[PDB]
Curated annotation (Swiss-Prot):
Coiled coil start-end: none
Catalytic residues identified in the record: A28 (nucleophile), H89 (proton acceptor)
The reaction(s) this protein catalyses: Hydrolysis of gamma-D-glutamyl bonds to the L-terminus (position 7) of meso-diaminopimelic acid (meso-A2pm) in 7-(L-Ala-gamma-D-Glu)-meso-A2pm and 7-(L-Ala-gamma-D-Glu)-7-(D-Ala)-meso-A2pm. It is required that the D-terminal amino and carboxy groups of meso-A2pm are unsubstituted
Protein name: Peptidoglycan amidase Tse1
Recorded GO CC terms: extracellular region; host cell membrane; membrane
UniProt gene name: tse1
Organism, as annotated: Pseudomonas aeruginosa (strain ATCC 15692 / DSM 22644 / CIP 104116 / JCM 14847 / LMG 12228 / 1C / PRS 101 / PAO1)
GO molecular function, one term: amidase activity
Domain of life: Bacteria
Length: 147
Protein backbone atom coordinates (compact mmCIF):
# COMPACT_ATOMS: atom_id res chain seq x y z
CA UNK A 1 0.00 0.00 0.00
CA UNK A 2 1.26 3.42 -1.08
CA UNK A 3 -0.56 5.66 1.43
CA UNK A 4 2.45 6.28 3.67
CA UNK A 5 3.04 9.90 2.64
CA UNK A 6 -0.62 10.73 3.39
CA UNK A 7 -0.47 8.99 6.77
CA UNK A 8 2.68 11.00 7.52
CA UNK A 9 0.96 14.18 6.40
CA UNK A 10 -1.86 13.39 8.84
CA UNK A 11 0.50 12.65 11.74
CA UNK A 12 2.34 15.90 11.03
CA UNK A 13 -0.82 17.97 10.71
CA UNK A 14 -2.24 16.58 13.96
CA UNK A 15 -0.22 18.96 16.14
CA UNK A 16 -0.26 21.93 13.75
CA UNK A 17 -2.71 24.86 13.84
CA UNK A 18 -4.04 26.00 10.51
CA UNK A 19 -5.96 28.70 12.44
CA UNK A 20 -4.17 30.84 15.01
CA UNK A 21 -4.44 29.26 18.48
CA UNK A 22 -6.49 26.34 17.22
CA UNK A 23 -4.82 22.92 17.19
CA UNK A 24 -5.89 20.95 14.10
CA UNK A 25 -6.99 18.06 16.32
CA UNK A 26 -9.83 20.34 17.47
CA UNK A 27 -10.68 21.61 13.98
CA UNK A 28 -11.78 19.26 11.16
CA UNK A 29 -11.47 21.77 8.30
CA UNK A 30 -8.10 23.05 9.50
CA UNK A 31 -6.74 19.53 9.88
CA UNK A 32 -7.43 18.61 6.25
CA UNK A 33 -6.09 22.00 5.11
CA UNK A 34 -2.76 21.16 6.73
CA UNK A 35 -2.73 17.63 5.26
CA UNK A 36 -3.38 19.12 1.79
CA UNK A 37 -0.80 21.91 2.17
CA UNK A 38 1.76 19.29 3.15
CA UNK A 39 1.04 17.16 0.07
CA UNK A 40 1.08 20.07 -2.41
CA UNK A 41 -2.65 19.58 -3.10
CA UNK A 42 -5.06 22.53 -3.65
CA UNK A 43 -7.93 22.34 -1.16
CA UNK A 44 -11.14 24.41 -1.31
CA UNK A 45 -10.93 26.79 1.70
CA UNK A 46 -13.47 27.55 4.44
CA UNK A 47 -15.41 25.66 7.08
CA UNK A 48 -16.42 22.02 6.57
CA UNK A 49 -19.65 22.90 4.69
CA UNK A 50 -17.84 25.30 2.35
CA UNK A 51 -15.13 22.68 1.66
CA UNK A 52 -17.73 20.03 0.81
CA UNK A 53 -19.39 22.52 -1.64
CA UNK A 54 -16.05 23.11 -3.33
CA UNK A 55 -15.09 19.38 -3.42
CA UNK A 56 -18.47 18.64 -4.95
CA UNK A 57 -17.88 21.32 -7.63
CA UNK A 58 -14.33 20.43 -8.57
CA UNK A 59 -13.19 16.98 -7.38
CA UNK A 60 -13.76 13.43 -8.60
CA UNK A 61 -16.47 11.66 -6.60
CA UNK A 62 -16.07 7.96 -5.75
CA UNK A 63 -18.82 5.34 -5.62
CA UNK A 64 -18.20 3.72 -2.20
CA UNK A 65 -16.05 3.62 0.93
CA UNK A 66 -14.37 0.59 -0.66
CA UNK A 67 -13.41 2.64 -3.73
CA UNK A 68 -12.17 5.35 -1.30
CA UNK A 69 -9.83 3.02 0.62
CA UNK A 70 -8.64 1.64 -2.73
CA UNK A 71 -7.79 5.14 -3.91
CA UNK A 72 -5.88 5.86 -0.71
CA UNK A 73 -3.93 2.59 -1.20
CA UNK A 74 -2.93 3.88 -4.67
CA UNK A 75 -1.53 7.05 -3.09
CA UNK A 76 -4.31 9.55 -3.70
CA UNK A 77 -5.58 12.06 -1.17
CA UNK A 78 -9.20 11.12 -0.38
CA UNK A 79 -11.67 13.30 1.57
CA UNK A 80 -14.85 11.92 3.14
CA UNK A 81 -17.24 14.81 3.70
CA UNK A 82 -20.84 15.50 4.70
CA UNK A 83 -22.70 18.80 5.10
CA UNK A 84 -24.92 19.40 8.09
CA UNK A 85 -27.77 21.88 8.45
CA UNK A 86 -25.61 23.70 10.98
CA UNK A 87 -22.02 22.40 10.54
CA UNK A 88 -20.47 19.78 8.27
CA UNK A 89 -17.52 17.44 8.83
CA UNK A 90 -14.54 16.37 6.71
CA UNK A 91 -11.84 13.69 7.09
CA UNK A 92 -8.88 12.10 5.30
CA UNK A 93 -9.50 8.51 4.24
CA UNK A 94 -6.59 6.05 4.45
CA UNK A 95 -5.97 2.45 3.38
CA UNK A 96 -6.82 -0.48 5.61
CA UNK A 97 -9.54 -3.14 5.98
CA UNK A 98 -13.12 -1.77 6.03
CA UNK A 99 -15.01 -1.50 9.30
CA UNK A 100 -18.23 -3.53 9.33
CA UNK A 101 -17.05 -4.51 5.83
CA UNK A 102 -18.15 -1.12 4.43
CA UNK A 103 -16.53 1.97 6.03
CA UNK A 104 -12.88 3.04 5.48
CA UNK A 105 -10.31 4.04 8.15
CA UNK A 106 -9.60 7.73 8.55
CA UNK A 107 -7.96 10.72 10.26
CA UNK A 108 -9.94 13.74 11.42
CA UNK A 109 -9.89 16.55 13.93
CA UNK A 110 -13.03 17.67 15.71
CA UNK A 111 -14.12 20.51 17.96
CA UNK A 112 -16.24 17.79 19.64
CA UNK A 113 -13.24 16.29 21.49
CA UNK A 114 -12.13 12.65 21.39
CA UNK A 115 -15.50 11.26 20.24
CA UNK A 116 -15.13 13.29 17.06
CA UNK A 117 -11.46 12.68 16.44
CA UNK A 118 -9.53 9.86 14.85
CA UNK A 119 -5.81 9.12 14.51
CA UNK A 120 -6.16 6.47 11.83
CA UNK A 121 -7.66 3.79 14.11
CA UNK A 122 -11.31 4.82 13.85
CA UNK A 123 -13.24 4.40 10.59
CA UNK A 124 -15.70 6.89 9.09
CA UNK A 125 -18.47 4.71 10.46
CA UNK A 126 -17.22 5.38 13.98
CA UNK A 127 -16.82 9.11 13.63
CA UNK A 128 -20.10 9.83 11.88
CA UNK A 129 -23.24 8.36 13.48
CA UNK A 130 -25.42 5.43 12.43
CA UNK A 131 -27.59 7.39 10.00
CA UNK A 132 -24.91 9.78 8.68
CA UNK A 133 -22.35 7.01 8.06
CA UNK A 134 -24.33 5.87 5.02
CA UNK A 135 -24.66 9.35 3.48
CA UNK A 136 -20.94 10.24 3.16
CA UNK A 137 -19.38 11.46 -0.06
CA UNK A 138 -15.87 10.50 -1.11
CA UNK A 139 -13.70 12.84 -3.15
CA UNK A 140 -10.33 12.05 -4.66
CA UNK A 141 -7.73 14.42 -6.04
CA UNK A 142 -6.78 13.87 -9.72
CA UNK A 143 -3.04 13.32 -9.18
CA UNK A 144 -1.41 10.87 -6.78
CA UNK A 145 0.61 12.31 -3.93
CA UNK A 146 2.75 9.25 -3.06
CA UNK A 147 5.45 8.01 -5.43
Amino acid sequence: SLDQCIVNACKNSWDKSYLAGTPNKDNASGFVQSVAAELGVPMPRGNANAMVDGLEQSWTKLASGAEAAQKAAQGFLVIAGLKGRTYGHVAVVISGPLYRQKYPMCWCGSIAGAVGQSQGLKSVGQVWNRTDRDRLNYYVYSLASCS
